[PDB]
Amino acid sequence: TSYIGGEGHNLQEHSVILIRGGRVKDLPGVRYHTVRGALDCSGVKDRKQARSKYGVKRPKA
Amino acid sequence: ARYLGPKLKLSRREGTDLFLKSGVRAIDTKCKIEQAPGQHGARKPRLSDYGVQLREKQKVRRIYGVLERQFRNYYKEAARLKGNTGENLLALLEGRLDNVVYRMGFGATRAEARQLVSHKAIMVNGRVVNIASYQVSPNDVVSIREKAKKQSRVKAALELAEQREKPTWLEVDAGKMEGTFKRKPERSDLSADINEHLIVELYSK
Amino acid sequence: MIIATAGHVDHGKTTLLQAITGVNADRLPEEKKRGMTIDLGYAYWPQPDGRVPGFIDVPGHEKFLSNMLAGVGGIDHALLVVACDDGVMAQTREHLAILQLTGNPMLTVALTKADRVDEARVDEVERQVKEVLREYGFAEAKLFITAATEGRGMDALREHLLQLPEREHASQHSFRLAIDRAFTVKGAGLVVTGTALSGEVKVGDSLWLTGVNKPMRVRALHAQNQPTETANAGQRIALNIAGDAEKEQINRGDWLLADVPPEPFTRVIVELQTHTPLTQWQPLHIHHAASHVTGRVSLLEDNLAELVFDTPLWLADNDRLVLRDISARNTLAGARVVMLNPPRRGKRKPEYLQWLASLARAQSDADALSVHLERGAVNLADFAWARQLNGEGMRELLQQPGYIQAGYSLLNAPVAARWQRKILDTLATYHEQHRDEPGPGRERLRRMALPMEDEALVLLLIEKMRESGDIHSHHGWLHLPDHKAGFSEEQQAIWQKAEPLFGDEPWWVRDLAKETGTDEQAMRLTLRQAAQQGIITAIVKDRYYRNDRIVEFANMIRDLDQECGSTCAADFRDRLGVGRKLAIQILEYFDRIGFTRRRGNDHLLRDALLFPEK
RNA sequence: AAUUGAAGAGUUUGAUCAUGGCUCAGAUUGAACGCUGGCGGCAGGCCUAACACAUGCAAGUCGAACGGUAACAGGAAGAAGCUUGCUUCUUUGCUGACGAGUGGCGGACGGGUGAGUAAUGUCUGGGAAACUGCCUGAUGGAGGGGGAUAACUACUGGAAACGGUAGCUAAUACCGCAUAACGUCGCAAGACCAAAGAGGGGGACCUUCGGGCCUCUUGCCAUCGGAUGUGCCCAGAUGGGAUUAGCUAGUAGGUGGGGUAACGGCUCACCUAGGCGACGAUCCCUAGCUGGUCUGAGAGGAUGACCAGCCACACUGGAACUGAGACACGGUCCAGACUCCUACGGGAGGCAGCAGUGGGGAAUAUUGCACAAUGGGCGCAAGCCUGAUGCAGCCAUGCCGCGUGUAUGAAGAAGGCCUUCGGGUUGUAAAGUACUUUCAGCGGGGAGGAAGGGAGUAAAGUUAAUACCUUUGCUCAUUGACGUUACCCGCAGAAGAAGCACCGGCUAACUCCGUGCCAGCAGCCGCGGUAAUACGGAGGGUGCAAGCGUUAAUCGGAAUUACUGGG
RNA sequence: GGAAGAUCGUCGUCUCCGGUGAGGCGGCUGGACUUCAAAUCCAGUUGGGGCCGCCAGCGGUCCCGGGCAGGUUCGACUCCUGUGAUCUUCCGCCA
Ligand SMILES: Nc1nc2c(ncn2[C@@H]2O[C@H](COP(=O)(O)OP(=O)(O)NP(=O)(O)O)[C@@H](O)[C@H]2O)c(=O)[nH]1
Ligand SMILES: [Mg+2]
Ligand SMILES: [Mg+2]
Ligand SMILES: [Mg+2]
Ligand SMILES: [Mg+2]
Ligand SMILES: [Mg+2]
Ligand SMILES: [Mg+2]
Ligand SMILES: [Mg+2]
Ligand SMILES: [Mg+2]
Ligand SMILES: [Mg+2]
Ligand SMILES: [Mg+2]
Ligand SMILES: [Mg+2]
Ligand SMILES: [Mg+2]
Ligand SMILES: [Mg+2]
Ligand SMILES: [Mg+2]
Ligand SMILES: [Mg+2]
Ligand SMILES: [Mg+2]
């Protein structure tokens, strides 16, 4: 079981995502994170700084 | 690579005269160097050890306009070199061609030196060099290309050179604006502001 | 010569093709199994002449109509097989309506099952077909009576297909490709096959795959079952491409195209022509080349309709698409993509006239170029995208005279002049509003004039006026040439009482304000303007003197190079009696001026007139 | 001269000192993922499925070994056209050459991969009982005969694959015979063992006028030396597990036979009962080893990607032949699974070669150019071959270098943010003015990688010989894939080019707004419950920079396996 | 791509429901109460669109809504007919 970061997500029934390490230290037994922005896990929108994390393209303007 | 931004906010982060932009003046002083390093620049901040030695290292590496990875290269060779690591570090860092161009005096600022050397104007031993990192060997003359001569910038800088009082380890004629480099300086003949051992232990972690 | 077979089910669509081309269209096992054409099959007819016609066989079933709309793209000629069994049937009508909305130029009716019904029925069906064709706007049509089983009228039908002309497209166009079947051939790569709507491609080209959104190098290609180094529009192009994407990821309805496209847009305007009236804000199925989407239509003015997509889609200007009933069954209306980026304020009275201007008025890109200019500034990214214009084609705007081309958007000479006038009069208003200022700055001008526009165009336009000489500026302050930085009486009234005062000994700002009962900030600014006039000089911030003492300050500095040869403080007290604070501020005033310069212990004299003749 | 080298921090408590974990600061990588991305150099680039493979190429060469003439170019008798000296046609291996065939040499090198292997391997150091093609030194021979056979011809089998029947022919193919000891055997006496020619030139002379003869080059057989390469033995070193303690019947020794290039239970007959093992036998799990790479003050720890040496393997499992060398990647034979054709008899195939495709995976490239250089095969040589190699393509994967301007510029503009509403900050930053043009773009010039090889010529050497051939000079013409090369010279315009992370402590860098233990952040300790420097946005700063972050891995710190260096 | 199938109100889920909806459970907001919770009683918990003036984390109007339409019926979340979003299963992709 892998944690999901950021505010809001599109993940539902069978979704193919890819996971990276790191542990949350609150929910014992989740040793992983899912990356935002790779395969079927969409980069959280409505976010500006720290956006290489969370995988959202830059605003044009 | 290069910085490309406000010079004298970098000059006023350390509150020193960093020589970054001189031209008609030396220090601007009308630009409020000590009073505004940033929005919270006005309030003085206590500096912890890592901050004093890192702040110093940032200072010197800005005054000579070098980035950090080739500055770390300069350090690893400096250590590998025989003799005191601080002294010969600084000395080999002054061997940089752009620094020399500034010390011979023909140039406005070391960034202008970067300009002039990058633009094919410099000539060493009858060969042209673009590289600002080129370490000038001792007892070697360096000139500026004959067609590069007649540029307005070089003399208007020569005037500045006479004003700054010149260095004693280099002999510059400046009749043809061709000077000769002599020997690598020693820590005692220059600066008395940078404290280099702060850098050497900062990299001794 | 792409020729698509259409007609109702089991009216001999495929059998005709095998007769003409000796190619069994059905390839899928199930169609073999069930005796039908579940999905689109392709047949080709190479000729010794060296030109190969392209044959696209589409189903007739209403259920598989969504498939037929993918293959009706880019047809040069369409042949509707009608079988004399029941003759014209409703589905035949549906195929005709679909071909009408796609605006195919011409069609050949070929009548099958001649053997099955006697000649009378041949004449009757002939009459009925000739009557139906008039309904859907195809007047001239060539009716052939043939039975593919015996090949009776196959020969007569053959010459006509070769006689068909090939409908050409403009020489300069961005290559645009409609993906149809993404299938991996075992040998060498990913080969995605699709109809090339426009342009040419060669083996070295780099393309941008959509939905994967990744560039892909063409490994190899087949023009129409023929290996070649180049591929031109008007034919199915098998395209073997390298890159990051793969077949499973590719979904029919992806575009391959030469350059990164702007973000897909949900809203769009369409010319509207329909067989049955529509209704405002109603759900429908939008069918675009190899694409199925559901969006809700709106009605604006006359034959102008608005499509809103719940699924974003890449469209280009002048793209015919079909709008069908949302629950299917009925083809009701047609569509053309006219504007790619409609904003709000749709039904406002001035704009509908404009929409008429943009669409009915122009059938070509150059005319469109003028229309958009009338509307405002024209972004080359958007215009290139809408018109699919190549570099050579794009440069043609540049060739037309009177076009302002800044960093991005084009501007017509009339509209440019209009903006110039607006900017000038706005300039004049600001000029009048502050009469104590040297002028407005460049950027402030752009913000006070047209904040919503592109910066490069508006500023370049400003440059145009600068060069014309309508605006003369000094020190980077742009004021009308007429301005003299004279001032207003409101300042002079203080400056009259301030005059004797200033004369017999000048004093500091805060003291001045205290002496004349005027606000400190007001007093400092009015005197700064007085100093811009040349009446008083600040040797240091907030300290103002007359001129007659400035020259006297130079008289005291005059004796230093000649009597000493150095500059030091001591002589302040030992020469006239002028204080140290005063003398030092004098020096910094002259250092900024350039009368003296400071280095270590002494001041230099590189550029002043302090020097006497001898 | 070859070293010069060792740092700490946070968290147990109300506070303290100890013990002890966890976490961080460093360096590194064949890395991947997110955002961003201008250029150049030099590197590197299936770590997973030793999983399956479409298509193309990756081993040929010698007519100076031979019989020949399939294809081409000459020449020849002739055809004899007509343009009467240009052209038309048969015949002609007779010359240059050469398909197919026999023969020689190569294919046992070069290239790939790490499945197996805990020793049959590898490294270090010794040794006796060996063999070694082409290379090199010496000593000598190289005489004299025959019978076939492929190609070819006539027939025939079969779709193909490949054969079969009959007849003919050559060889540096093969077999006799003669000869031969410093060679083999044997204590000795004695007995026994081999060969092959071809090419270039040539005065006299032979001339079945085919050729013999002279000279040179090169080839062949024998024995001993050298180099080289390889086989075999031995001692030590090279993982983990005792929650594996017994193991071995050809295995432990002998005598004799056999076998090998050679010692050897290598193998067999008979005899004896040995032999290995708490210094870990046997069994199990994992594994290619090494020079070295990373790290560390060091001692150690991890590791074995690139480069070089050795080993093993070639669809899986076996076997042998030819050979100096194989139990053989692109050889043979049988079996097996899987793919393919077929006329249903039968065949065919093996990318862990270079590309490339499918699959697996977080992930790893072009179905390119050249033999110009180095090297290799064959050849007298020219040459031909060469996916070795040289280069190019792709990818920020790494390391390194450069640029994205420089100088001046204050009523310190506007906008943004903040305010104590006085102002501060962004900020010399922008604007303006005066300059440059690096790289990129456009156009010209322009090295080096090229040594030799070929033709001619001169001398010397050789020889019967002013010839051939060899050597070394001299003259000529020429050999570049990269390549639109590096580099240089002109043109125009600052013109075409800056991000990413962080800002509570550790750890460099703080303020306002939104939310209100919700939404979220988190390497650790923690934040958020209506005044959040920790969340989200903004403004400002800081650190790195064509990169910045995150994740994974190793060492360090960790004296936290303590030999140095603990209890 | 085809065929078969599941689900998709009004904050979430289940039971339904031809009288214009009902009921349970939970969640959220507000009240009593505190630093905020938990607990115990109370009160509430329709959304989305088009057109028009700011973009204002709006203001009016009109409409539609058990995924999106239609038909039935006096009246449909419920009956019936199409089709879409995500998604399960089988089949096939061959320039
Ligand atoms: N007598 C006759 N029958 C024909 C002819 N052409 C087709 N058919 C009938 O059509 C059947 C095959 O169908 P097809 O020709 O493919 O009709 P189609 O319209 O192409 N099939 P679909 O519409 O589903 O694609 C045959 O069984 C045959 O009976 C014709 O020329 N003559
Ligand atoms: Mg059909
Ligand atoms: Mg049917
Ligand atoms: Mg609707
Ligand atoms: Mg505590
Ligand atoms: Mg041999
Ligand atoms: Mg004999
Ligand atoms: Mg072997
Ligand atoms: Mg092979
Ligand atoms: Mg995969
Ligand atoms: Mg070949
Ligand atoms: Mg760098
Ligand atoms: Mg250039
Ligand atoms: Mg002689
Ligand atoms: Mg954070
Ligand atoms: Mg240790
Ligand atoms: Mg201890």
Short mmCIF file of C-alpha atoms (C1' of nucleotides) in Angstrom, two decimals, chain D residues 48-328:
data_model
loop_
_atom_site.label_atom_id
_atom_site.label_comp_id
_atom_site.label_asym_id
_atom_site.label_seq_id
_atom_site.Cartn_x
_atom_site.Cartn_y
_atom_site.Cartn_z
"C1'" U D 48 15.50 -7.45 -16.27
"C1'" A D 49 13.65 -12.82 -20.06
"C1'" A D 50 21.06 -17.44 -21.56
"C1'" C D 51 13.26 -15.05 -23.67
"C1'" A D 52 11.47 -15.64 -29.10
"C1'" C D 53 13.28 -13.82 -33.57
"C1'" A D 54 11.17 -10.88 -39.80
"C1'" U D 55 14.95 -8.57 -43.30
"C1'" G D 56 19.86 -7.17 -44.63
"C1'" C D 57 25.04 -7.75 -43.78
"C1'" A D 58 29.21 -10.06 -40.18
"C1'" A D 59 34.90 -15.32 -43.94
"C1'" G D 60 36.99 -15.54 -47.28
"C1'" U D 61 40.97 -15.85 -50.70
"C1'" C D 62 44.98 -18.09 -54.58
"C1'" G D 63 44.54 -18.93 -62.36
"C1'" A D 64 52.16 -17.62 -59.61
"C1'" A D 65 48.59 -25.60 -57.91
"C1'" C D 66 45.18 -27.90 -61.63
"C1'" G D 67 41.65 -29.53 -65.65
"C1'" G D 68 38.96 -25.68 -67.93
"C1'" U D 69 35.93 -21.12 -70.53
"C1'" A D 70 30.16 -19.86 -67.56
"C1'" A D 71 30.62 -14.08 -68.05
"C1'" C D 72 33.55 -9.91 -70.17
"C1'" A D 73 37.75 -7.52 -73.04
"C1'" G D 74 41.47 -8.43 -76.88
"C1'" G D 75 43.63 -11.23 -80.75
"C1'" A D 76 43.02 -15.03 -84.71
"C1'" A D 77 41.16 -18.14 -89.46
"C1'" G D 78 37.06 -16.93 -91.63
"C1'" A D 79 32.32 -14.63 -92.58
"C1'" A D 80 32.47 -9.69 -96.38
"C1'" G D 81 28.82 -5.70 -94.62
"C1'" C D 82 29.71 -1.21 -97.13
"C1'" U D 83 31.74 3.79 -94.55
"C1'" U D 84 36.30 -0.63 -99.60
"C1'" G D 85 39.69 -0.33 -94.39
"C1'" C D 86 34.97 1.73 -90.63
"C1'" U D 87 31.57 -2.09 -90.08
"C1'" U D 88 28.55 -7.31 -90.21
"C1'" C D 89 29.02 -12.82 -88.38
"C1'" U D 90 30.67 -17.91 -87.08
"C1'" U D 91 34.75 -20.34 -85.20
"C1'" U D 92 38.94 -19.93 -81.95
"C1'" G D 93 41.16 -20.61 -74.00
"C1'" C D 94 45.17 -18.55 -77.55
"C1'" U D 95 46.13 -13.79 -74.07
"C1'" G D 96 44.10 -10.33 -70.19
"C1'" A D 97 40.91 -12.51 -66.72
"C1'" C D 98 37.15 -15.58 -64.45
"C1'" G D 99 31.51 -18.18 -62.93
"C1'" A D 100 31.05 -23.42 -61.44
"C1'" G D 101 34.71 -27.77 -59.97
"C1'" U D 102 39.23 -30.37 -57.46
"C1'" G D 103 43.44 -28.71 -54.44
"C1'" G D 104 46.14 -25.15 -50.59
"C1'" C D 105 45.63 -21.90 -46.50
"C1'" G D 106 41.99 -19.61 -43.54
"C1'" G D 107 37.11 -20.85 -41.04
"C1'" A D 108 40.00 -23.28 -33.60
"C1'" C D 109 41.68 -15.74 -34.83
"C1'" G D 110 38.74 -11.65 -34.70
"C1'" G D 111 33.28 -10.48 -32.15
"C1'" G D 112 29.25 -11.57 -28.16
"C1'" U D 113 27.19 -13.19 -23.36
"C1'" G D 114 28.08 -14.55 -17.80
"C1'" A D 115 23.73 -19.47 -18.08
"C1'" G D 116 26.84 -23.03 -15.73
"C1'" U D 117 31.48 -23.36 -12.40
"C1'" A D 118 32.70 -23.25 -4.68
"C1'" A D 119 36.91 -25.71 -8.43
"C1'" U D 120 37.83 -29.23 -13.95
"C1'" G D 121 37.99 -22.39 -12.46
"C1'" U D 122 41.05 -17.73 -11.21
"C1'" C D 123 45.54 -15.31 -8.86
"C1'" U D 124 50.48 -15.79 -6.75
"C1'" G D 125 54.84 -18.94 -6.86
"C1'" G D 126 57.24 -23.36 -8.31
"C1'" G D 127 57.87 -27.93 -11.45
"C1'" A D 128 58.51 -32.47 -15.44
"C1'" A D 129 56.39 -36.17 -18.16
"C1'" A D 130 54.89 -32.87 -23.28
"C1'" C D 131 53.23 -31.09 -28.13
"C1'" U D 132 53.62 -26.55 -31.25
"C1'" G D 133 50.81 -24.74 -38.61
"C1'" C D 134 52.43 -20.18 -40.60
"C1'" C D 135 57.82 -17.27 -38.23
"C1'" U D 136 63.28 -17.82 -37.80
"C1'" G D 137 68.90 -20.56 -37.74
"C1'" A D 138 71.66 -24.61 -39.42
"C1'" U D 139 72.41 -29.21 -41.86
"C1'" G D 140 70.84 -32.18 -46.14
"C1'" G D 141 67.64 -33.98 -49.76
"C1'" A D 142 63.92 -33.02 -53.43
"C1'" G D 143 64.95 -39.76 -57.42
"C1'" G D 144 61.85 -42.96 -59.93
"C1'" G D 145 56.18 -45.05 -61.18
"C1'" G D 146 50.88 -45.91 -60.96
"C1'" G D 147 45.43 -46.07 -60.18
"C1'" A D 148 41.49 -42.94 -59.71
"C1'" U D 149 38.28 -38.81 -59.06
"C1'" A D 150 35.34 -34.05 -59.06
"C1'" A D 151 34.45 -30.67 -62.95
"C1'" C D 152 32.68 -32.36 -68.24
"C1'" U D 153 29.50 -35.64 -71.45
"C1'" A D 154 24.84 -39.06 -72.26
"C1'" C D 155 20.73 -40.80 -69.01
"C1'" U D 156 17.66 -40.44 -64.76
"C1'" G D 157 15.46 -39.34 -59.37
"C1'" G D 158 12.84 -35.50 -57.00
"C1'" A D 159 8.35 -29.48 -55.96
"C1'" A D 160 12.49 -28.21 -53.46
"C1'" A D 161 16.55 -30.04 -50.80
"C1'" C D 162 20.08 -32.73 -52.68
"C1'" G D 163 21.43 -37.12 -55.39
"C1'" G D 164 22.01 -41.75 -58.30
"C1'" U D 165 23.62 -44.67 -63.17
"C1'" A D 166 27.36 -45.14 -67.18
"C1'" G D 167 31.89 -43.07 -69.57
"C1'" C D 168 36.31 -39.48 -69.75
"C1'" U D 169 40.32 -36.16 -67.53
"C1'" A D 170 44.27 -33.07 -64.49
"C1'" A D 171 46.88 -31.61 -60.30
"C1'" U D 172 51.51 -29.01 -55.40
"C1'" A D 173 44.85 -34.40 -54.54
"C1'" C D 174 46.12 -39.93 -53.26
"C1'" C D 175 49.01 -44.58 -53.17
"C1'" G D 176 53.45 -47.61 -54.49
"C1'" C D 177 58.64 -48.13 -55.20
"C1'" A D 178 63.92 -46.16 -54.56
"C1'" U D 179 66.58 -43.47 -51.15
"C1'" A D 180 68.03 -41.34 -45.84
"C1'" A D 181 70.79 -40.73 -40.57
"C1'" C D 182 72.88 -36.66 -35.60
"C1'" G D 183 65.44 -39.45 -36.80
"C1'" U D 184 62.09 -44.17 -34.41
"C1'" C D 185 62.66 -48.93 -31.84
"C1'" G D 186 66.34 -51.94 -29.75
"C1'" C D 187 71.82 -53.07 -24.47
"C1'" A D 188 73.59 -53.98 -29.15
"C1'" A D 189 73.64 -56.17 -33.59
"C1'" G D 190 70.43 -54.77 -36.50
"C1'" A D 191 65.49 -53.52 -38.63
"C1'" C D 192 62.31 -49.12 -40.43
"C1'" C D 193 60.61 -44.29 -42.10
"C1'" A D 194 59.57 -38.81 -46.90
"C1'" A D 195 59.17 -35.31 -50.98
"C1'" A D 196 55.87 -31.50 -55.41
"C1'" G D 197 56.40 -28.53 -58.36
"C1'" A D 198 55.30 -23.72 -60.26
"C1'" G D 199 56.62 -18.72 -62.04
"C1'" G D 200 59.82 -14.52 -64.54
"C1'" G D 201 63.88 -13.75 -67.81
"C1'" G D 202 67.38 -15.71 -71.09
"C1'" G D 203 73.10 -15.93 -75.00
"C1'" A D 204 75.10 -20.29 -76.76
"C1'" C D 205 73.16 -25.21 -77.05
"C1'" C D 206 69.59 -29.00 -77.30
"C1'" U D 207 64.33 -28.71 -79.88
"C1'" U D 208 59.30 -36.14 -80.51
"C1'" C D 209 60.50 -28.27 -82.84
"C1'" G D 210 55.22 -29.67 -77.06
"C1'" G D 211 59.85 -29.02 -74.79
"C1'" G D 212 64.69 -30.06 -72.97
"C1'" C D 213 69.18 -26.36 -70.94
"C1'" C D 214 71.15 -21.79 -67.70
"C1'" U D 215 69.84 -18.34 -63.71
"C1'" C D 216 66.75 -16.32 -60.09
"C1'" U D 217 62.23 -16.18 -56.97
"C1'" U D 218 58.97 -19.15 -54.45
"C1'" G D 219 56.82 -23.87 -53.04
"C1'" C D 220 57.82 -29.52 -50.79
"C1'" C D 221 60.20 -33.70 -47.32
"C1'" A D 222 63.82 -35.00 -42.94
"C1'" U D 223 66.39 -33.93 -38.15
"C1'" C D 224 68.07 -30.63 -34.51
"C1'" G D 225 67.75 -25.36 -32.21
"C1'" G D 226 65.09 -20.35 -31.06
"C1'" A D 227 60.69 -17.78 -30.41
"C1'" U D 228 55.62 -18.50 -29.66
"C1'" G D 229 51.24 -20.86 -28.13
"C1'" U D 230 49.12 -24.69 -25.57
"C1'" G D 231 48.43 -29.29 -22.36
"C1'" C D 232 49.60 -31.44 -17.27
"C1'" C D 233 51.24 -31.40 -12.06
"C1'" C D 234 52.05 -29.09 -7.13
"C1'" A D 235 51.78 -25.44 -2.65
"C1'" G D 236 49.30 -21.31 -0.80
"C1'" A D 237 45.17 -17.71 -1.55
"C1'" U D 238 39.78 -17.21 -3.29
"C1'" G D 239 31.71 -17.00 -0.38
"C1'" G D 240 27.56 -18.19 3.36
"C1'" G D 241 25.11 -22.33 6.31
"C1'" A D 242 26.60 -27.38 11.87
"C1'" U D 243 18.71 -25.38 12.23
"C1'" U D 244 24.18 -30.12 6.82
"C1'" A D 245 28.77 -34.96 10.76
"C1'" G D 246 29.69 -38.32 8.56
"C1'" C D 247 31.46 -39.20 3.25
"C1'" U D 248 33.85 -42.30 -0.77
"C1'" A D 249 33.86 -49.09 -4.04
"C1'" G D 250 37.51 -46.92 -9.42
"C1'" U D 251 36.90 -43.37 -5.51
"C1'" A D 252 42.76 -44.91 -1.62
"C1'" G D 253 47.52 -47.34 -2.98
"C1'" G D 254 50.02 -51.61 -5.75
"C1'" U D 255 51.69 -55.14 -10.12
"C1'" G D 256 50.60 -55.92 -15.33
"C1'" G D 257 48.08 -54.78 -19.71
"C1'" G D 258 45.64 -50.70 -22.57
"C1'" G D 259 45.33 -45.54 -23.78
"C1'" U D 260 47.26 -40.12 -24.45
"C1'" A D 261 51.36 -35.40 -27.84
"C1'" A D 262 52.65 -36.31 -22.41
"C1'" C D 263 52.62 -37.89 -16.14
"C1'" G D 264 48.33 -39.90 -14.19
"C1'" G D 265 42.45 -45.36 -11.78
"C1'" C D 266 42.75 -41.77 -17.57
"C1'" U D 267 40.82 -47.23 -18.34
"C1'" C D 268 40.61 -52.70 -17.34
"C1'" A D 269 42.33 -57.33 -14.83
"C1'" C D 270 44.11 -59.13 -10.11
"C1'" C D 271 45.80 -57.79 -4.89
"C1'" U D 272 45.75 -54.94 -0.44
"C1'" A D 273 42.00 -51.71 2.74
"C1'" G D 274 42.40 -47.96 2.44
"C1'" G D 275 41.29 -42.64 1.81
"C1'" C D 276 38.86 -37.39 3.15
"C1'" G D 277 37.00 -34.77 7.87
"C1'" A D 278 35.81 -29.80 14.05
"C1'" C D 279 42.65 -26.55 10.40
"C1'" G D 280 34.72 -28.12 8.68
"C1'" A D 281 34.73 -33.76 4.75
"C1'" U D 282 29.90 -34.60 2.30
"C1'" C D 283 25.18 -31.87 1.33
"C1'" C D 284 22.49 -27.23 0.56
"C1'" C D 285 22.08 -21.55 -0.99
"C1'" U D 286 24.45 -17.98 -3.87
"C1'" A D 287 28.58 -16.95 -7.51
"C1'" G D 288 32.36 -16.34 -13.46
"C1'" C D 289 37.80 -15.10 -11.26
"C1'" U D 290 41.78 -11.22 -11.55
"C1'" G D 291 44.52 -6.35 -12.71
"C1'" G D 292 41.33 -3.06 -10.47
"C1'" U D 293 36.39 0.76 -9.56
"C1'" C D 294 34.07 3.27 -5.33
"C1'" U D 295 34.94 4.57 -0.28
"C1'" G D 296 38.04 5.32 3.95
"C1'" A D 297 43.31 9.01 7.39
"C1'" G D 298 44.45 4.11 7.42
"C1'" A D 299 43.41 -0.75 8.59
"C1'" G D 300 39.19 -2.26 6.44
"C1'" G D 301 34.01 -2.41 3.66
"C1'" A D 302 31.46 -2.97 -0.82
"C1'" U D 303 32.33 -4.32 -5.72
"C1'" G D 304 34.12 -6.79 -10.54
"C1'" A D 305 29.86 -1.72 -15.35
"C1'" C D 306 33.73 0.52 -19.13
"C1'" C D 307 39.32 -1.08 -20.51
"C1'" A D 308 43.06 -5.63 -20.48
"C1'" G D 309 44.30 -11.11 -18.96
"C1'" C D 310 42.15 -16.09 -17.94
"C1'" C D 311 37.68 -19.55 -17.75
"C1'" A D 312 32.99 -21.27 -19.46
"C1'" C D 313 28.84 -21.29 -23.28
"C1'" A D 314 26.68 -20.91 -28.67
"C1'" C D 315 18.31 -23.21 -29.31
"C1'" U D 316 18.37 -27.72 -25.23
"C1'" G D 317 21.03 -32.77 -24.57
"C1'" G D 318 24.71 -35.75 -26.44
"C1'" A D 319 28.75 -37.87 -29.91
"C1'" A D 320 32.66 -37.78 -32.98
"C1'" C D 321 35.32 -36.50 -37.49
"C1'" U D 322 38.79 -33.16 -40.19
"C1'" G D 323 42.64 -30.95 -38.26
"C1'" A D 324 49.18 -28.06 -35.73
"C1'" G D 325 45.15 -26.42 -33.03
"C1'" A D 326 37.78 -27.91 -31.95
"C1'" C D 327 34.97 -32.07 -29.21
"C1'" A D 328 34.07 -26.21 -33.15
#
